[PDB]
Amino acid sequence: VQLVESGGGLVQPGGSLRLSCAASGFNVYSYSIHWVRQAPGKGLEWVASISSYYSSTSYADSVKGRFTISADTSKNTAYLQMEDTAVYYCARSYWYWRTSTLGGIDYWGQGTLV
Amino acid sequence: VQLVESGGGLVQPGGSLRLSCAASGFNVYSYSIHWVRQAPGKGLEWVASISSYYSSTSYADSVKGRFTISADTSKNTAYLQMEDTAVYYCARSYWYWRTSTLGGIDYWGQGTLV
Amino acid sequence: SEAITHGTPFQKAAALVDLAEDGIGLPVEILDQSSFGESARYYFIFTRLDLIWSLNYFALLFLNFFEQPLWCEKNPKPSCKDRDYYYLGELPYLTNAESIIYEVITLAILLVHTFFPISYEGSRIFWTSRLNLVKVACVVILFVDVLVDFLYPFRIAPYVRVIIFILSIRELRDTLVLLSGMLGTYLNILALWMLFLLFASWIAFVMFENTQQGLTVFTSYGATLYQMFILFTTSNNPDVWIPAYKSSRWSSVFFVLYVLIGVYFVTNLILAVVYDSFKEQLAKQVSGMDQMKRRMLEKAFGLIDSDKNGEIDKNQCIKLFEQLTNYRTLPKISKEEFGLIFDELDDTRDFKINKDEFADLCQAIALRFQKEEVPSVQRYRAFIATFITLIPSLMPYLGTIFCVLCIYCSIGVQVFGGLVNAGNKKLFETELAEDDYLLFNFNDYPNGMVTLFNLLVMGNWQVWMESYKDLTGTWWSITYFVSFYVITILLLLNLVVAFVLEAFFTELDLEEEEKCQGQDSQEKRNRRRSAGSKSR
Amino acid sequence: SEAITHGTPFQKAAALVDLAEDGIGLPVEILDQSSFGESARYYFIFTRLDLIWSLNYFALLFLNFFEQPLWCEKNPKPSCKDRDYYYLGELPYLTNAESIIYEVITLAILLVHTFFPISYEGSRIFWTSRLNLVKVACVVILFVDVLVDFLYPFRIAPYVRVIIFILSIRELRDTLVLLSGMLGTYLNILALWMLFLLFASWIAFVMFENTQQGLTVFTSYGATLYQMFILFTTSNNPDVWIPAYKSSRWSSVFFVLYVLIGVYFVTNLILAVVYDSFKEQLAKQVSGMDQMKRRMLEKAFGLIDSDKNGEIDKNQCIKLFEQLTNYRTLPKISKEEFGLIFDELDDTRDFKINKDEFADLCQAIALRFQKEEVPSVQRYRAFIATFITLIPSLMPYLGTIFCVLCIYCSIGVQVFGGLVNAGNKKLFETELAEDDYLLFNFNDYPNGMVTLFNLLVMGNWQVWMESYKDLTGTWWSITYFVSFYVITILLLLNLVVAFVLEAFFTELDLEEEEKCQGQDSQEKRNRRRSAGSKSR
Amino acid sequence: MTQSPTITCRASVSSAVAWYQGKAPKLLIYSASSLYSGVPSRFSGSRSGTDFTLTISSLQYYCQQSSSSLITFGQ
Amino acid sequence: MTQSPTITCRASVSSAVAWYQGKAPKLLIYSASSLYSGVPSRFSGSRSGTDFTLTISSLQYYCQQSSSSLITFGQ
Ligand SMILES: CCCCCCCCCCCCCCCC(=O)O
Ligand SMILES: CCCCCCCCCCCCCCCC(=O)O
Ligand SMILES: CCCCCCCCCCCCCCCC(=O)O
Ligand SMILES: CCCCCCCCCCCCCCCC(=O)O
Ligand SMILES: CCCCCCCCCCCCCCCC(=O)O
Ligand SMILES: CCCCCCCCCCCCCCCC(=O)O
Ligand SMILES: CCCCCCCCCCCCCCCC(=O)O
Ligand SMILES: CCCCCCCCCCCCCCCC(=O)O
Ligand SMILES: CCCCCCCCCCCCCCCC(=O)O
Ligand SMILES: CCCCCCCCCCCCCCCC(=O)O
Ligand SMILES: CCCCCCCCCCCCCCCC(=O)O
Ligand SMILES: CCCCCCCCCCCCCCCC(=O)O
Ligand SMILES: CCCCCCCCCCCCCCCC(=O)O
Ligand SMILES: CCCCCCCCCCCCCCCC(=O)O
Ligand SMILES: [Ca+2]
Ligand SMILES: [Ca+2]
Ligand SMILES: [Ca+2]
Ligand SMILES: [Ca+2]
Ligand SMILES: [Ca+2]
Ligand SMILES: [Ca+2]
Ligand SMILES: [Ca+2]
Known part of the structure; x- marks a missing residue:
């Protein structure tokens, strides 16, 4: 049910990776995904959101245009085409527009090391 | 390889049947189908033609609008939606436009009794 | 109640x-x-x-x-x-x-x-x-x-x-979002319109300057851009080029080809651009209008579930069709409507638990049944199907223009105010006096509200222009009457012409596919609707 | 060689x-x-x-x-x-x-x-x-x-x-197939145009008949159909309705709403109909032309099969590409093309081309390679992509009209023949004498070839009409100048306007999808082209 | 599209005629000059203007004609 | 989007707050008035105008804020 991130291999500067956010608790259309990371020592940072409901795949200020997000409803996976030395997490807000207040981001992933 | 007609059951006046013209020698798009019948005692009579090539499904004068023809390329079958007391035959002319001379209609079906 | x-x-x-x-x-x-x-x-x-x-x-x-x-x-x-x-x-x-x-x-x-x-x-x-x-x-x-x-x-x-x-x-504020999204496209094609008149007034300056045209009318390059602007409009038509025609018959070939190009290629390829940027900005507004009701259908979904996990049960669906107060019986809906869902989960034998399942479910009901009921010709059909459709469908695209003619009136009442007088002397030789317009005026606010209508239709539109340039003395009065032209060759080609084309292609679609869907199946399909609107 | x-x-x-x-x-x-x-x-x-x-x-x-x-x-x-x-x-x-x-x-x-x-x-x-x-x-x-x-x-x-x-x-004969396939659609919408003027001239005769309009201009009923016909055109514009404006200002609301409806709904919904029967008759001609390609590509297929079986051989496909003279390394392409073609028989490994497999193959090679050699701006692009495309693409739709103006000239040289004379007296009070259109004449074949141009542009088009109704005396000279209106504002809205719209939408999809031609796939597919044609 | 009881047919002047013969019709001469295979040559064809000379020689019949897609037998 | 070391956050006036806490962040309070389940209530929340009173009580932190789709943590 809970989150699985995948695609977090060993990346070189220059090129990049392509993530994936696997799920088994009906986690597109309804419970939509958020990519939030954390560089070591830092706090968190939001890097990508998505609605498979509204069809809006929107993301941040400091990564705007850098990092591309997509999905796969049929396997409930949220892809993410990519100092990015970071630790990526996924997230399941129930809301999409103002998920700060009432959704939160309920279930967080297991962790990775990108 | 050679022709198989099917759909020739036992028809009542009023309603009608739906034929089928099975084939195994690549007999749509290349070698296209002709429905020709014969009432008992009479001569032949042409009742329906088709191109899976040109996408033209045209047919006669005395049956114009009465009898509907269609196809199934994936199983090489030519359907035919229907005093029609007749004996239906299928046919494989190679030429479509003026098949009178340069195709003939090469292979004739096994026969039916409609 | x-x-x-x-x-x-x-x-x-x-x-x-x-x-x-x-x-x-x-x-x-x-x-x-x-x-x-x-x-x-x-x-x-x-x-x-x-x-x-x-x-x-x-x-x-x-x-x-x-x-x-x-x-x-x-x-x-x-x-x-x-x-x-x-x-x-x-x-x-x-x-x-x-x-x-x-x-x-x-x-x-x-x-x-x-x-x-x-x-x-x-x-x-x-x-x-x-x-x-x-x-x-x-x-x-x-x-x-x-x-x-x-x-x-x-x-x-x-x-x-x-x-x-x-x-x-609301709709005039919403229309004016299109015109401010369309405007960067239109000022390019305006900036290639001017380059048509700037070039073709230069050859018309060059070719005729010695002879009898370009001593009479085509005097200097100001008054050929000015004249060839009004020939672009067609409204000036043989009176520009008679004394070139009277002196050599061959100079019609310049002028019967300039107004051939100026009206049938360029004016249509201003219409084609402004109808191209109407198609894009309108669907950009419909997709901004969908989320105004799609946000409702995440606020609809997000009150049904108790714990906010993202689900509805089947009886939990059926308990709400009675809240619709539309259809009579309960079990004959979801047994029929789940088959009407093109992409049902069928995770359980009863429920279908996603939010985008419900997002099209509560929109398909409003088209098929239409049974809320709050107590509180064939040959001429496709024309008057559109002609009756269009009377409230242009009231936001003909209320913008009435609020462009209520800007220009108030400008025109003030820039060109109580000047056409029966005391005036330079009036009585203009074209207003000989055609007797001499009303259609710009002195009151509904003297000049109507005057801008005649300028909008372009019936003798240069009589007011060429007469107000002589009453105010300047050449700067021209710019009131060129800017009216430009904005209402956006507005009278965008919001009016390009709409009445695509409103005919929809009361073409509700007549052509009504016959098709009447023979295709017994009830409404959601995938033919998504494919048919993406064709024209 | x-x-x-x-x-x-x-x-x-x-x-x-x-x-x-x-x-x-x-x-x-x-x-x-x-x-x-x-x-x-x-x-x-x-x-x-x-x-x-x-x-x-x-x-x-x-x-x-x-x-x-x-x-x-x-x-x-x-x-x-x-x-x-x-x-x-x-x-x-x-x-x-x-x-x-x-x-x-x-x-x-x-x-x-x-x-x-x-x-x-x-x-x-x-x-x-x-x-x-x-x-x-x-x-x-x-x-x-x-x-x-x-x-x-x-x-x-x-x-x-x-x-x-x-x-x-050939192309003028081919164009004239559209105009005879479009004509049954157009005479309906002509017959509802006419009912717009017949009705709106009846209220305009009813409403103003006692007062100062309907004594001056709107005298009978027939001279209001006649006047309200020319207001449909807009060209008559305040001069029709000045003495119903001078006497009550309120009666412009009849006339500022009639020419609002007459030009912005009806004229566009004559344009939208004649656009719509241009879309259908043109693709009816392309499918009458594409089926003639397949006449050749069944005569191409059927010269090769000396066996007379139904399919051709892959090595025979390659070894006949040497006469094709397109590329040097022959067999390294046809194995790639079987995946480039969406279908393949696969009854055999190599020698399997069904006749419709070949029918799209020889229509792919000539479009990708384009190498036979018989020895014998971004902001303004989408406009001049079309504007250069259009010049030979309207020469069959502007050569029909030149052969409509060469019918009406020869009529007009014979009906209105030697009448505008400097000996004439009924001439010198018409609008030809005061506006000084005394060439533009009809007294000859290229006097009157140009006159029909001015009538075609609609620049002061009723000066000639109201003159020849007075020079020939009868009201029957009207019908020459109403026929030209009907036929050639079919023709100047069908094959000229509606073409330049649909020719802009093709040099707009060869610029938007051209980005997809270098990003989605480097080599051309057949099913994406068939899907993009129905989608826009 | 009229036969004649050495057999002829009627009426699309030179390449609109094939000639056939319990049984389904067997094709005999497509083009009315080209003997179809598997067949002894006692049946030959000849186009004679507006007549189609199907031919009986040896001792031991539904001619055909289209123009575009509509096809006219004999009987 | 500024924390304060009884913990507060900054800056979307009353419903723009989630309040979280080796570990991935665990959610604690959505809306700063609604304890998320499975967790003891020694952590409570309160919206105080332009400040978000996240709250320590008992002895034995990444507040959040969006408006439409762009979301602003603390640190
Ligand atoms: C496509 C650009 C070409 C058109 C520009 C040509 C300039 C006009 C011809 C010479 C006239 C110059 C304008 C008047 C200046 C003056 O007062 O002398
Ligand atoms: C974009 C279309 C043009 C808009 C109006 C046309 C401008 C022409 C202005 C003419 C300027 C004055 C005439 C020059 C001769 C003179 O008066 O000395
Ligand atoms: C802001 C849009 C500008 C549109 C066109 C403006 C052109 C202004 C100049 C007109 C041509 C030259 C004016 C007089 C020429 C002359 O004196 O010979
Ligand atoms: C868009 C709404 C307001 C825009 C209109 C602002 C007015 C533009 C022109 C100003 C009117 C006064 C003209 C100045 C010249 C003069 O007084 O003679
Ligand atoms: C809705 C936008 C309208 C604003 C544009 C209108 C103002 C452009 C010109 C106004 C008058 C300018 C020339 C003044 C004539 C004069 O000074 O005599
Ligand atoms: C797009 C609309 C632009 C309006 C066109 C220009 C209006 C300004 C007049 C043209 C320049 C004339 C200069 C002559 C000045 C004078 O003699 O007083
Ligand atoms: C929609 C159709 C209604 C319009 C029909 C108009 C009826 C005729 C107009 C009234 C006057 C009659 C004609 C006067 C000329 C005459 O008869 O001599
Ligand atoms: C297609 C639009 C109609 C064409 C215009 C029709 C002109 C009708 C006018 C003829 C009647 C003359 C007016 C009555 C007064 C009279 O002549 O005695
Ligand atoms: C064939 C197209 C006809 C279109 C309209 C034809 C008009 C015929 C007459 C219209 C008005 C009748 C004249 C009324 C006044 C009169 O002359 O008595
Ligand atoms: C695109 C819309 C164009 C609008 C044109 C405006 C037409 C309205 C004219 C109203 C005139 C009113 C005169 C009042 C006379 C009276 O006192 O009775
Ligand atoms: C479409 C090509 C030929 C069609 C044109 C045929 C001529 C129609 C009108 C005949 C011209 C002579 C007019 C008769 C009245 C008169 O002579 O005064
Ligand atoms: C849609 C096309 C409209 C066609 C309009 C016709 C224009 C051609 C006019 C030719 C006039 C020839 C007179 C030349 C006299 C001479 O050189 O001696
Ligand atoms: C391409 C088709 C054109 C044919 C139509 C043109 C003929 C319609 C009217 C011709 C003149 C009719 C009226 C004659 C005037 C008069 O007799 O004085
Ligand atoms: C579709 C175009 C048709 C042409 C329109 C009709 C031609 C004019 C009809 C008006 C004639 C009125 C009768 C008056 C006869 C007369 O006074 O001699
Ligand atoms: Ca005019
Ligand atoms: Ca005009
Ligand atoms: Ca639940
Ligand atoms: Ca199910
Ligand atoms: Ca005048
Ligand atoms: Ca072969
Ligand atoms: Ca293969």
């Missing part, structure tokens, strides 16, 4: 009956009104106190707006003999004691329109919206101007009254 | 490209020339004897046609003082000894043009063609008329010369 009043707490399944209703006919609640968790607080009573008393807020907008034709002229205050009519109009002139018991009554019902959403927004949600910061500033203009008109430049009252009237009526 | 003829030896590799080339640029071969067994017989030599000497047959069509502006007038034969120019043109008038050494030269190249496909069709294939019967009859008219013009009604010479010229140039 009546289900309108329910800000007084409805049930958790009975508070659905509004937000599921407000996706059907496309109303809007504020995203700040949905921002609170309950959606039944004081922020919701005080939106239904708006849209119920919403006729004191829209017929005020005409009581505001039509005080412009019932004003005075700007300037009979210097001049002599007003009451002797020097070609003026017909309406009365409201005196200053009649403009104060009609600008307070207009500005008692306009602050109560503008300082009403403070009863459903905050002291800081309100003031950060900019279609709201403006409409407070527009009123403080009208509140300063009422203060000035009580105790005694160029009087910017009647331009604000248009601008309030645009922002207040 | 030379690959022009190649039909006389005509081998299985040599005659293969003789027809596989003729599917590329879409040439015509007669279905009678194809229905013969060999396609290399006595008939095929004598079609390449046509399309090689095909410049003596098309530049004759002007030498035929432009003898009309270089004729005489019909009627200075009764009248007195021809050489004194009574407002005539400037071209010379060919004498009868100059019309006989120029109508035999023109008719030595019609009994060579029309009796040439007796050299590739039979004595009875010819005369059963319903067009070929016409162009023999048109010449026997011109052969009778040359006989009459040698030894001495209304002289139907110059109407045949248009009609030969339409049937002879």
